[PDB]
């Protein structure tokens, strides 16, 4: 149903992340959320260390 690969890329970006954009925008959002996820996991590790 896609007119072209550009529109299809935009649809993929919109499906994976709320913000529409290009492949670079997809990568940037995924990198930012990966950093946040790593920070949260390190926070869990810090909770374990603190309760220790």
């Amino acid at each position: 149903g896609f007119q072209n690969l550009s529109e299809f890329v935009t649809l993929i970006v919109q499906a994976v992340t709320g913000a529409p954009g290009g492949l670079t925008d997809l990568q940037a959002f995924l990198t930012e959320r990966w950093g946040d996820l790593a920070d949260a996991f390190q926070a869990v590790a810090n909770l374990i260390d603190a309760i220790a």
Binding site: N4, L5, S6, F8, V9
Partner: protein, 63 residues
């Protein structure tokens, strides 16, 4: 069948105007398969509709 004017009686836009001999008869022996093939391959490569279709396919449709 005579042209009272000079070389201006010929039509430069004719289909075979490039192959009309005036005094360069040494070029007749150069009309072999390879040279004609290269000339026409160059023309087909320079064809405009196919080039526009290529642009549309590879840039628009394929991103």
């Amino acid at each position: 069948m005579t042209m009272p004017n000079g070389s201006g009686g010929l039509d430069p836009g004719a289909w075979l105007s490039h192959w009309v001999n005036q005094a360069d008869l040494s070029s007749l022996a150069g009309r072999t398969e390879d040279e004609v093939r290269a000339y026409f391959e160059n023309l087909v490569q320079a064809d405009s509709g196919w080039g526009d279709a290529s642009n549309t396919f590879f840039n628009l449709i394929l991103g």
